[PDB]
Amino acid sequence: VIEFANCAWTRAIGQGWETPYRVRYASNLDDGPWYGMPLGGFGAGCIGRSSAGDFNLWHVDGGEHIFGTLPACQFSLFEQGEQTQAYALGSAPKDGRLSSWQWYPAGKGTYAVRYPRSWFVYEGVFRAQITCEQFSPILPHNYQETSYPVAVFLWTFSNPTDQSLTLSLMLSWQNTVGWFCNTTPSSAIAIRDDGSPVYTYTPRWGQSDGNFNELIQTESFQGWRLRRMPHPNPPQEGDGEWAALIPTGLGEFFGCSRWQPEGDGAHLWQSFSVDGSLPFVNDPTPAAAGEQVAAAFALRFSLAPGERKQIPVVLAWDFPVTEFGKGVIYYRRYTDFCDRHGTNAVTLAAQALAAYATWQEQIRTWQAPILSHPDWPDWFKMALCNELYVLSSGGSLWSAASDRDPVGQFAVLECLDYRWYESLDVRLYGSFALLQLWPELEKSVMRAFARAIPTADPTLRIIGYFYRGDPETAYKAPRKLANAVPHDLGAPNEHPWEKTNYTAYQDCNLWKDLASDFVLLVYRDFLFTGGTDLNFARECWPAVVAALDHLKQFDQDGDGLPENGGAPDQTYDDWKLQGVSAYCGGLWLAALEAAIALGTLLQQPQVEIYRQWLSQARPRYHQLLWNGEYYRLDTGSGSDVIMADQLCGQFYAQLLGLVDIVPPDCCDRALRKIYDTCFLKFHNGQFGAANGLLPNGQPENPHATHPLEVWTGINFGLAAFLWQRGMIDEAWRLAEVVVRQIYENGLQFRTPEAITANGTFRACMYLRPMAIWALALVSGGSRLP
């Protein structure tokens, strides 16, 4: 019933972790290990349900994070054969709400995920065989259903006994209309102890005044709908509705539109647990001050010995507005297929009821090349799908179409701790999945970068790295310089896409990697979507020119190579570099090569300038940095550290079909050293490749941050590089280590930037690990959807 369970992440239902990874800094986010698969489309707002059955992640407010169970949001099962049994399929509340309810025994079945499909298989409690498959229609190359705020729960019931069974399936849900908005928007921005800017989120959690629920009963479908009176027009953030529907004709429908989710639940349970019915209630009286309201329905049916029945239950949520900074209003993409009124949940659920079997067939179809691939291990097939989860839960935005953005604009947060979008350094490896599966979204992201590059905001703001607790005294830099390459596309407390370079940790006006990243991403996106989108190319080309001139100014001595200096000036933003670095120098060489290739196609005059620079810079890079076994960190520090990601530029150059930026034998020697040192002499290869070690496997400084962390996404980029250079076995072994760390130690569906050798993590729900797709791309040959 679970298709290809070996290519799925599995855990017994409600089975926890003895010692899961924990956050390395106490100021940062750690909700604990009970993340399950997120439900809902990209930019739809999403909800997540744990492997214990709890609906515990609430991302209905775009870009905002709420973790916590609403126990009344739950499926419950009744069975009568010889005995009678009924259970709610989550954890017993720790506070004694719903005290009359019984909660399904832990460990009596399996939870399985291959995103966007998940299954609960209950076994050992009911006589019947029961599977709930939960999915949303996440569909590569589909810019419609992939945006939808719907979840399908497909239930399969089989009777293996020779005794007839009566079953009832209940869905209850609390009405949270109006909860998911910020009552303190555009709040004072603090500097956290780590130096990141943060704002205050005060949601209207538990504020249900005016909320009301109604039964839905037509010839085609029945269920309930959750609303609020009055519903303004236009809607504000938080305004909308929920609906859940089943088809008619499957059994006997009981509807109770209004019950009390903070009470003991006995009005429901007294019926349900006894015969599988509910008291009939259609009562749309709006909730009083201080009162919570929930709905429920149940479908009762018989199952003859050997019979098998399916019941599609769909859940939709229409919350059309995403407000960022006060007054900054966007509509969600899915409104392009209904409307912007916030009155369409039944329409979306009805669509889901009609199309769910098509959607499921389509998911099977796009996963089939991955699952059948002869040269990929099962653990990899699983991780390739599962790492996609972040496109839904990473505060994802997908706005309504316009003329200049015909499928909408798109953005994933860097993470929850670092609350800004599509960080350019991070997406250099993080964006490979988006490129492969939603190239139109990928291109919209890069166009947003291109539009921002010529913009400026000269306003001085505090730089977190230097902040010492006194605003008046604190070092400040201009928010953005004209033609500098922004770090990110803004934040959910300000203005995504339009107000860029939000992070204040460093002055990214000074970064020596961003410009080269920009160019490489533009050329990659053009190249890998077939080399025919001349519109994209011509739109980005002025920004390519601006970016390369921006970065050239940091070539102080005129050898052709930009020089690192000052505070950390690249993606390793705790790590000071001095002079030409392997890292930035290499990205620059690849970027020049990219601009030359693209500029030649577009017939642009700057190509000759770039060729001149490249002719000086490429030989000089090797001449300054080759030490005999690897490339030195940088020309100025005198460090002997082997930086794992030193030849990122050579990975990219070869990926883009461009000329090698270094001699190919030196590339392979360096790569061999990195593997043998950063990986095999770091705690014996137990965690993956550390970012920087001495040739003897020791830290240069034992008090360092970045050098001694294993970055998931860097590892996956390194694995792709290994594979590309013919070190196939190495590649699989490195990638395998990192996948096992994530999936075994309680980081599933919140993959972090970093793990340590001390069982800690940094920055859960991170953008970079989607770089697993880069390994898929280099190794997939012909396949991939």
Ligand X SMILES: OC[C@H]1O[C@@H](O)[C@H](O)[C@@H](O)[C@@H]1O
**Contact positions vs Ca ion (CB under 5 A):** 61, 323
CA–CA dist 423, 412 (Å, integer): 9
753 binds, among Ca ion, ligand X, none (CB under 5 to 8 A by kind): ligand X
Nearer to ligand X, 207 or 571 (CB): 571
Cis peptide before 230 (omega within 30 of 0): yes
418 binds, among ligand X, Ca ion, none (CB under 5 to 8 A by kind): ligand X
241 binds, among Ca ion, ligand X, none (CB under 5 to 8 A by kind): none
- In the block, which residue shows the tokens 């599977």? 131
Q: From the CB of 754, what's the least distance to ligand X, in Å?
A: 6
Q: Provide the residue type at 749 as one letter.
A: F
751 touching ligand X, by CB under 6 A: no
Q: From the CB of 769, what's the least distance to ligand X, in Å?
A: 12
Instruction: Tell me the sheet residues that pair with 174.
Output: 294
Q: List the structure tokens of 210.
A: 């005016």
Nearer to Ca ion, 62 or 140 (CB): 62
CA–CA dist 244, 175 (Å, integer): 12
- In the block, which residue shows the tokens 């034992």? 702
Beta strands in 625-734 (DSSP E): 642-643, 692-693, 710-711
CA-nearest of 417, 167, 208, 402 to 299 is 167
Nearer to ligand X, 101 or 429 (CB): 429
Contacts to ligand X from residues 211-240, by CB under 6 A: none
Beta-strand relationship, 109-114 and 197-198: unpaired
Residue nearest to ligand X (CB): 571
The three-state DSSP-derived secondary structure of 305-335 is CCCEEEEEEEEEEECCEEECCCCCEEEEHHH
277 touching ligand X, by CB under 6 A: no
Residue nearest to Ca ion (CB): 323
Nearer to ligand X, 131 or 196 (CB): 196
Cα four-point dihedral sign 683, 685, 687, 689: positive
Q: From the CB of 747, what's the least distance to ligand X, in Å?
A: 15
Q: With beta carbons less than 8 A apart as the criterion, state whether 491 and 442 touch.
A: no
Q: From the CB of 655, what's the least distance to ligand X, in Å?
A: 20
Segment holding 520, helix H or strand E: helix 514-528
Nearer to Ca ion, 60 or 755 (CB): 60
- Binding residue for ligand X (CB under 6 A) from 503, 581, 650, 751? 503
318 binds, among ligand X, Ca ion, none (CB under 5 to 8 A by kind): none
273 binds, among ligand X, Ca ion, none (CB under 5 to 8 A by kind): none
CA–CA dist 109, 459 (Å, integer): 57
CA-nearest of 222, 206, 205, 203 to 214 is 222
Nearer to ligand X, 180 or 711 (CB): 711
Q: With beta carbons less than 8 A apart as the criterion, state whether 635 and 580 touch.
A: yes
323 binds, among Ca ion, ligand X, none (CB under 5 to 8 A by kind): Ca ion
Site string (414-433) toward ligand X, x via CB under 6 A: x---x----x-xx-------
Nearer to ligand X, 189 or 250 (CB): 189
Q: List the structure tokens of 86.
A: 């009924």
Q: Exposure string (b/e) for 401-426, b if CB count within 10 Å is 16 or more?
A: eeeebebbbbbbbbbbbbbbbbbbbb
Q: From the CB of 25, what's the least distance to ligand X, in Å?
A: 12
Site string (621-640) toward ligand X, x via CB under 6 A: --------------------
423 binds, among Ca ion, ligand X, none (CB under 5 to 8 A by kind): ligand X
Site string (515-554) toward ligand X, x via CB under 6 A: ----------------------------------------
387 touching ligand X, by CB under 6 A: no
Q: With beta carbons less than 8 A apart as the criterion, state whether 747 and 764 touch.
A: yes
Instruction: Tell me the sheet residues that pair with 660.
Output: none
571 binds, among ligand X, Ca ion, none (CB under 5 to 8 A by kind): ligand X
Segment holding 273, helix H or strand E: helix 266-275
Could you tell me which residues come within 8 angstroms of residue 721 by beta carbon, excluding any fewer than 6 positions away?
Answer: 647, 650, 651, 671
Contacts to ligand X from residues 318-337, by CB under 6 A: none
Q: From the CB of 427, what's the least distance to ligand X, in Å?
A: 10
Q: From the CB of 63, what's the least distance to Ca ion, in Å?
A: 6
Q: From the CB of 762, what's the least distance to ligand X, in Å?
A: 7
Nearer to Ca ion, 61 or 422 (CB): 61
336 binds, among ligand X, Ca ion, none (CB under 5 to 8 A by kind): none
Phi first, then psi: give them for residue 732, nearest 5 degrees. -60, -40
Cis peptide before 234 (omega within 30 of 0): yes
Q: From the CB of 179, what's the least distance to Ca ion, in Å?
A: 12
DSSP code of residue 726: T
426 binds, among Ca ion, ligand X, none (CB under 5 to 8 A by kind): ligand X
571 touching ligand X, by CB under 6 A: yes
Segment holding 117, helix H or strand E: strand 117-122
Long-range contacts: 606-615, Cβ < 8 Å, 24+?
A: 606/545, 606/548, 610/548, 613/552, 613/560, 614/560, 614/589, 615/560
Q: From the CB of 493, what's the least distance to Ca ion, in Å?
A: 8
503 binds, among Ca ion, ligand X, none (CB under 5 to 8 A by kind): ligand X
- Binding residue for ligand X (CB under 6 A) from 153, 497, 505, 651? 505
Could you tell me which residues come within 8 angstroms of residue 255 by beta carbon, excluding any fewer than 6 positions away?
Answer: 215, 217, 222, 223, 224, 278, 280, 281, 282, 296, 297
CA–CA dist 142, 41 (Å, integer): 11
Q: From the CB of 395, what's the least distance to ligand X, in Å?
A: 14
573 touching ligand X, by CB under 6 A: yes
Nearer to Ca ion, 36 or 325 (CB): 325
Q: From the CB of 198, what's the least distance to ligand X, in Å?
A: 12
634 binds, among Ca ion, ligand X, none (CB under 5 to 8 A by kind): none
Which residues of the chain come before a gap where C and the next N are over 2.5 Å apart?
none
Nearer to Ca ion, 54 or 417 (CB): 417
- Binding residue for ligand X (CB under 6 A) from 753, 769, 771, 774? 753
Q: From the CB of 390, what's the least distance to Ca ion, in Å?
A: 19
449 touching ligand X, by CB under 6 A: no
Nearer to ligand X, 408 or 464 (CB): 464
Q: Determine what percent of the chain falls in helix, strand and coil, rounding each to the nearest 5.
A: 30, 20, 50
Q: From the CB of 415, what's the least distance to Ca ion, in Å?
A: 17
Nearer to ligand X, 75 or 429 (CB): 429
- In the block, which residue shows the tokens 């990929």? 376
Q: From the CB of 768, what's the least distance to ligand X, in Å?
A: 8
Q: From the CB of 469, what's the least distance to ligand X, in Å?
A: 20
91 binds, among ligand X, Ca ion, none (CB under 5 to 8 A by kind): none
CA–CA dist 533, 743 (Å, integer): 38
Binding site for ligand X (CB under 6 A): 414, 418, 423, 425-426, 503, 505, 571, 573, 753, 763
